[PDB]
Amino acid sequence: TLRRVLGLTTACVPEEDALTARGLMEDACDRLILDAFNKRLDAEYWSVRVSPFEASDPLPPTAFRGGALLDAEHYWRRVVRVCPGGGESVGVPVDLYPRPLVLPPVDCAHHLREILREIELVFTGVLAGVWGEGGKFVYPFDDKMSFLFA
Amino acid sequence: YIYLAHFECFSPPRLATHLRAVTTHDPNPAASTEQPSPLGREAVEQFFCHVRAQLGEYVKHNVTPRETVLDGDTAKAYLRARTYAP
Amino acid sequence: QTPLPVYRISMVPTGQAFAALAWDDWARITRDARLAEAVVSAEAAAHPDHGALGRRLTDRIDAGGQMYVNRNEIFNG
Amino acid sequence: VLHSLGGDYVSFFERKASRNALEHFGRRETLTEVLGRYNVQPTVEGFASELLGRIVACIETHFPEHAGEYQAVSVRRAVSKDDW
């Protein structure tokens, strides 16, 4: 997206470039969330490495049954937030359960929100850094493309 | 509707404008300072003509639609994922 | 193969019997109201109009045991 | 995918009545904005912490026959409506 948006050096008033940039950034977000759907069942792909220092989800009482798998955990805890039943989002320590895993559908309405958060940080930096400032690029995930997962 | 309409026609501001439109500054009928009242015309202009119109324009006014377009393999994916198996 | 329908069955005297099925004998359930192609087509021939073809076509019409007596499909958000 | 048609208050009567309410009665700020005043950017457990003490003080005065039960509990965020 940044390679395409700094390729817009075509002679234009700065105001025009801000909009034809924000449109492309929103389109890139769209193409990312569309491809996210085709990997909604790969829990290992939607996994975050929590450090032993960071705040961590509480360990389910059945992850203490991995046998010769609890030993692999030395530094990182790989957690995926799944959504059993409804409303509640619970964390699963991915590497403490035998494979292949069976899980409730992955709460992509939580991981994609954080990924998008950092994407909007980068996009707000570039939007307010090359052209005129004053624009916090926000993608309406909750309305435009929330239905795909929740 | 019934409360909204009674407000939109007979609200305190509209009523104040109307009573200021009928207040006189002279008793002679041919030299009266009273002027035509805007109550009904304003009420019809905003609420009533529009409601008579919505009486399928109702859909156009009250639709606020959100149709996301998903073309390609994602359409096939969304189908099996969110519909009873074939 | 998922996703699947989930139904609710009211029994006698009471008891909400929930039933999740992967396939079912719907041919048997609708067999009573299934009109053969010969019948439906024939009625139209001898009887014009789409306000009278339908008139004729309509005029021509244990939890496991209660499955084929009472079903209530349950909305899945 | 038609996944939203506005809501219960998109009727012209509903949208007109809501607009007249603001003009005549006043603006009722949303939950998020009000919580933002008490240094909460939704974090909600951050305020729920200090709130637990007041709630426990209330119960151990008005509802004492179960007093020593919520001395040590952890607020677990479950339901999130934009006003609840």
Side-chain angles (χ1 to χ4, degrees):
Chain A
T1 319
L2 286 195
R3 195 143 40 180
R4 275 172 339 166
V5 72
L6 287 196
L8 287 166
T9 63
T10 66
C12 282
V13 175
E15 321 186 0
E16 187 178 0
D17 285 333
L19 277 304
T20 171
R22 200 166 295 106
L24 269 59
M25 311 205 178
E26 225 150 33
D27 297 346
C29 280
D30 294 341
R31 273 162 320 260
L32 181 61
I33 316 192
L34 267 204
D35 246 9
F37 190 81
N38 302 354
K39 304 183 50 51
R40 69 194 173 280
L41 296 170
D42 197 338
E44 271 211 64
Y45 164 87
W46 294 95
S47 64
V48 281
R49 284 132 71 209
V50 192
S51 94
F53 294 129
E54 290 164 359
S56 187
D57 292 357
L59 259 290
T62 65
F64 303 83
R65 304 221 280 271
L69 245 176
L70 292 153
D71 282 339
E73 152 170 324
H74 62 297
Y75 203 180
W76 295 112
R77 177 186 303 299
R78 274 211 310 191
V79 169
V80 65
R81 281 269 267 258
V82 295
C83 185
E88 248 289 331
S89 191
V90 317
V92 163
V94 178
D95 61 356
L96 310 182
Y97 284 103
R99 293 178 179 83
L101 312 157
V102 316
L103 311 163
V106 178
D107 213 38
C108 300
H110 160 70
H111 303 258
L112 255 176
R113 304 220 199 192
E114 265 150 337
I115 311 204
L116 278 195
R117 254 192 51 260
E118 310 258 70
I119 278 174
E120 332 167 328
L121 276 195
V122 176
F123 282 164
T124 300
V126 58
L127 260 169
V130 201
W131 306 284
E133 314 199 356
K136 181 188 176 181
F137 164 80
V138 70
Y139 177 64
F141 179 76
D142 304 2
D143 312 298
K144 187 164 179 182
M145 192 95 88
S146 166
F147 71 101
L148 271 192
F149 314 110
Chain B
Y1 163 83
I2 87 164
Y3 282 130
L4 194 186
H6 281 107
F7 183 81
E8 258 287 356
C9 328
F10 288 18
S11 73
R14 300 288 182 268
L15 274 170
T17 66
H18 163 77
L19 314 173
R20 291 193 297 274
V22 299
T23 311
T24 173
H25 306 46
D26 164 72
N28 189 17
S32 190
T33 66
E34 319 159 30
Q35 282 183 3
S37 93
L39 202 63
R41 195 200 40 248
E42 281 170 349
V44 167
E45 262 166 342
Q46 300 134 0
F47 197 50
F48 281 102
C49 64
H50 291 154
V51 295
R52 248 64 181 275
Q54 85 179 324
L55 257 54
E57 185 188 355
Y58 139 82
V59 185
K60 306 172 58 63
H61 265 90
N62 318 326
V63 57
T64 322
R66 286 178 185 169
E67 38 199 41
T68 311
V69 187
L70 323 168
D71 313 350
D73 294 351
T74 199
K76 184 183 178 179
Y78 187 79
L79 246 38
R80 175 58 190 264
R82 313 296 166 181
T83 67
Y84 294 154
Chain C
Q1 305 212 351
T2 55
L4 279 186
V6 156
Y7 306 106
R8 172 196 308 179
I9 308 144
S10 297
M11 334 164 48
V12 85
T14 43
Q16 298 208 339
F18 292 60
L21 319 173
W23 41 88
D24 193 69
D25 206 8
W26 266 99
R28 159 193 168 182
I29 304 174
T30 66
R31 145 214 56 184
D32 302 341
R34 181 177 181 170
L35 291 213
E37 189 182 1
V39 171
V40 166
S41 300
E43 278 278 6
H47 211 86
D49 296 354
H50 289 119
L53 186 46
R55 164 60 100 97
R56 292 267 65 258
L57 261 39
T58 310
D59 272 21
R60 209 193 258 276
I61 290 296
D62 183 28
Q66 214 79 13
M67 277 174 52
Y68 301 88
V69 180
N70 193 10
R71 262 177 233 195
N72 302 266
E73 187 189 334
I74 270 171
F75 186 109
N76 202 350
Chain D
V1 185
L2 192 62
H3 58 86
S4 178
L5 278 181
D8 181 51
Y9 260 63
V10 291
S11 172
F12 182 74
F13 313 124
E14 308 300 329
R15 295 176 64 186
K16 209 69 191 68
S18 307
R19 156 82 275 193
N20 277 335
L22 282 83
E23 212 157 336
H24 191 328
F25 293 157
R27 169 196 214 176
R28 196 187 72 176
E29 334 165 78
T30 86
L31 170 69
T32 301
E33 311 147 340
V34 163
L35 255 164
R37 287 181 171 177
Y38 314 150
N39 288 355
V40 171
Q41 304 180 1
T43 47
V44 193
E45 291 88 312
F47 208 55
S49 56
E50 179 24 70
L51 276 174
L52 226 55
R54 317 170 43 88
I55 271 179
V56 164
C58 215
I59 178 175
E60 311 216 340
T61 289
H62 308 114
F63 282 151
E65 93 271 346
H66 300 291
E69 205 180 282
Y70 317 116
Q71 328 213 167
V73 278
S74 58
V75 285
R76 209 198 225 178
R77 186 171 49 192
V79 178
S80 189
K81 310 302 179 181
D82 247 1
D83 254 350
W84 200 245

